[PDB]
Amino acid sequence: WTNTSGSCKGRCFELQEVGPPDCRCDNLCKSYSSCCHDFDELCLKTARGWECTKDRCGEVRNEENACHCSEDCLSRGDCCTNYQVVCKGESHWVDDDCEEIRVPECPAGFVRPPLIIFSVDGFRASYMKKGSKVMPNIEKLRSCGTHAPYMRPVYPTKTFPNLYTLATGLYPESHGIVGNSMYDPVFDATFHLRGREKFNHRWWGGQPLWITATKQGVRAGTFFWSVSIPHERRILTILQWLSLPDNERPSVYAFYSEQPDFSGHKYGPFGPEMTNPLREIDKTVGQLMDGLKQLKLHRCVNVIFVGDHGMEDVTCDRTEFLSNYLTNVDDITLVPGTLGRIRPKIPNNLKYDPKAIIANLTCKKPDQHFKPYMKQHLPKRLHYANNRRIEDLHLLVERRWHVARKPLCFFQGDHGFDNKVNSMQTVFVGYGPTFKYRTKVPPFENIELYNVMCDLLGLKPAPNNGTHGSLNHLLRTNTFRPTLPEEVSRPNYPGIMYLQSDFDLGCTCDGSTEERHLLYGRPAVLYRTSYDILYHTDFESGYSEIFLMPLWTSYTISKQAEVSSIPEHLTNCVRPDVRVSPGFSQNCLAYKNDKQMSYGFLFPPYLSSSPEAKYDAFLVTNMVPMYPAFKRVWTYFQRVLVKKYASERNGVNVISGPIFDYNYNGLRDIEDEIKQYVEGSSIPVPTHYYSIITSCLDFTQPADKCDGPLSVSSFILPHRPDNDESCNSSEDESKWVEELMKMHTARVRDIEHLTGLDFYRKTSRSYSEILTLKTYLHTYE
Ligand X SMILES: *[C@@H]1O[C@H](CO)[C@@H](O[C@@H]2O[C@H](CO)[C@@H](O[C@@H]3O[C@H](CO[C@H]4O[C@H](CO)[C@@H](O)[C@H](O[C@H]5O[C@H](CO)[C@@H](O)[C@H](O)[C@@H]5O[C@H]5O[C@H](CO)[C@@H](O)[C@H](O)[C@@H]5O)[C@@H]4O)[C@@H](O)[C@H](O)[C@@H]3O)[C@H](O)[C@H]2NC(C)=O)[C@H](O)[C@H]1NC(C)=O
Ligand Y SMILES: CCCCCCCCCCCCCCCC(=O)OC[C@@H](O)COP(=O)(O)O
Ligand Z SMILES: *[C@@H]1O[C@H](CO)[C@@H](O[C@@H]2O[C@H](CO)[C@@H](O)[C@H](O)[C@H]2NC(C)=O)[C@H](O)[C@H]1NC(C)=O
Contact residues for K ion, defined by CB under 5 A: 591, 598
CA distance 115 to 97: 22
- H or E element in which residue 612 lies: helix 611-614
Residues 199-218 that bind ligand X (CB under 6 A): 205-206
If one asks whether residue 752 binds Ca ion (CB under 5 A), the answer comes out as: no
Candidate residues 104, 113, 161, 176; the one interacting with ligand X per rule CB under 6 A:
176
CA distance 535 to 543: 10
| Binding letters toward Zn ion, positions 145-184, x by CB under 5 A | --------------x-------------------------
78 known ligand binder: no
Q: Which is nearer to ligand Y, 176 or 576 (CB)?
A: 176
Name 65's Cβ contacts closer than 8 Å, sequence gap at least 6: 45, 47, 48
**534 closest CA partner among 517, 547, 520:** 517
| Binding letters toward Ca ion, positions 642-681, x by CB under 5 A | -------------------x-x-x-x-x------------
Listed as own residue / partner, the contacts of 590-596 with beta carbons closer than 8 Å and 24 or more positions apart are 590/506, 590/678, 590/679, 590/680, 590/681, 590/683, 591/625, 591/678, 592/506, 593/679, 593/680, 594/678, 594/679, 594/680, 595/679, 596/627, 596/679, 596/721
If one asks whether residue 3 binds ligand Z (CB under 6 A), the answer comes out as: yes
Q: Which amino acid is at 501?
A: S
CA distance 635 to 629: 10
Q: Which amino acid is at 456?
A: L
* Distance between start and end Cα atoms, the chain: 55
Applying CB under 6 A, the span of 158-166, 171-179, 314-322, 644-652 interacting with ligand Y comes to 158-166
Q: How far is the CB of 497 from ligand Z (least distance, A)?
A: 58
Candidate residues 140, 142, 147, 175; the one interacting with ligand X per rule CB under 6 A:
175
In this structure, what is the dihedral angle of CA atoms 487, 671, 774, 706, given to the nearest 10 degrees?
70
569 known ligand binder: no
Q: How far is the CB of 158 from K ion (least distance, A)?
A: 45
695 binds, among ligand Y, ligand Z, Na ion, none (CB under 5 to 8 A by kind): none
306 binds, among Na ion, ligand Z, Zn ion, none (CB under 5 to 8 A by kind): none
CA distance 296 to 283: 20
104-126 burial, b at 16+ Cβ within 10 Å, e below that, comes to bebeeebebbbbbbbbbbbbbbb
If one asks whether residue 360 binds ligand Z (CB under 6 A), the answer comes out as: yes
Return the CA Rg of the chain. 30
Q: Which is nearer to ligand X, 171 or 555 (CB)?
A: 171
Residues 304-333 that bind ligand Z (CB under 6 A): 326-327
Residues 165-184 that bind ligand Y (CB under 6 A): 166-167, 180
327 binds, among ligand X, ligand Z, K ion, none (CB under 5 to 8 A by kind): ligand Z
Q: Half-sphere exposure of residue 547, counting CA atoms within 13 Å on the CB side? A: 31
Residues 192-211 that bind ligand Y (CB under 6 A): 193, 209
| Binding letters toward Zn ion, positions 268-307, x by CB under 5 A | ----------------------------------------
**Biggest alpha carbon distance in the chain?**
104
778 known ligand binder: no
667 binds, among K ion, ligand Y, ligand X, none (CB under 5 to 8 A by kind): ligand X
If one asks whether residue 349 binds ligand Z (CB under 6 A), the answer comes out as: no
Point out the catalytic residue in the list 2, 146, 157, 159: 159
Name 293's Cβ contacts closer than 8 Å, sequence gap at least 6: 84, 90, 93
159 is a catalytic site residue: yes
Residues 102-141 that bind ligand Y (CB under 6 A): 117, 119, 121-122
Q: Which is nearer to ligand Y, 260 or 576 (CB)?
A: 260
Is beta strand 370-374 parallel, antiparallel or unpaired with respect to 302-307?
A: unpaired
**458 closest CA partner among 212, 104, 118, 146:** 212
Candidate residues 243, 656, 714, 729; the one interacting with Na ion per rule CB under 5 A:
729
User: Residue positions in the annotated binding site?
Assistant: 121, 159, 180, 261, 265, 308-309, 415, 661, 663, 665, 667, 669
User: Residue positions in the annotated binding site for Ca(2+)?
Assistant: 661, 663, 665, 667, 669
By annotation, the residues acting in catalysis are 159
- Tell me which residues touch Zn ion (CB under 5 A): 121-122, 159, 261, 308
